[PDB]
Amino acid sequence: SNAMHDLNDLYYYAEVVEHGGFSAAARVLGLPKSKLSRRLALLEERLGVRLIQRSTRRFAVTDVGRTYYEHCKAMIEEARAAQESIDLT
Amino acid sequence: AMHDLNDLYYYAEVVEHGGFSAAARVLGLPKSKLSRRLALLEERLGVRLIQRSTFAVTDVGRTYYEHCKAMIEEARAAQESIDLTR
Ligand SMILES: [Cl-]
Ligand SMILES: [Cl-]
Ligand SMILES: [Cl-]
Numbered sequence: 138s139n140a141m142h143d144l145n146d147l148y149y150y151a152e153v154v155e156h157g158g159f160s161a162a163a164r165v166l167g168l169p170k171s172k173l174s175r176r177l178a179l180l181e182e183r184l185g186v187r188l189i190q191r192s193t194r195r196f197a198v199t200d201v202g203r204t205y206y207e208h209c210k211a212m213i214e215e216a217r218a219a220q221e222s223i224d225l226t
Numbered sequence: 227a228m229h230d231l232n233d234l235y236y237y238a239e240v241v242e243h244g245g246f247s248a249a250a251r252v253l254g255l256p257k258s259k260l261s262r263r264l265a266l267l268e269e270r271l272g273v274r275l276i277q278r279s280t281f282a283v284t285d286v287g288r289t290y291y292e293h294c295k296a297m298i299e300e301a302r303a304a305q306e307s308i309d310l311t312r
């Protein structure tokens with residue numbers, strides 16, 4: 138595996154989770170649902186796991202999906218700390 | 227929203243390798259692309275990260291790298307949570 142394939146994929150996944158699906162995430166991220174849906178499916182295929190429950194009425198993550206998200210949320214918090222060290226200037 | 231997170235990873239490699247040439251080799255990228263990304267990065271940040279007087283990083287550039295390093299570690303931890311499951 139390569140943890141450095143595309144860091145934006147981890148960003149999008151954590152945001153779709155945080156905002157309960159592609160409807161809010163598209164407007165939170167200023168991106169189309171089509172791109173967000175494709176990247177998350179391609180991220181699942183690279184990781185070789187099932188992060189998302191395709192059977193639920195609403196968006197829902199698997200047990201593995203919840204662990205992966207919390208790691209994604211940590212990475213995002215660091216990237217915001219990087220930007221916040223600049224916003225002090 | 228946030229911008230391209232891969233640039234913070236590119237920046238850390240430029241710093242740890244001490245120049246665009248070395249970082250471009252291990253990343254599999256041309257120097258032009260690598261230089262294009264950091265130029266856009268310094269511009270949107272509004273601060274100078276790398277010194278141009280002599281390779282050397284600026285004071286705020288070193289502070290910014292410290293967070294990029296932590297960001298990469300958490301990205302590595304995320305993949306490990308998958309590799310452990312598989
Ligand atoms: Cl890695
Ligand atoms: Cl939705
Ligand atoms: Cl940002």
Ligand SMILES: [Cl-]
Nearest residue numbers: 258259262263
């Ligand atoms: Cl480019």
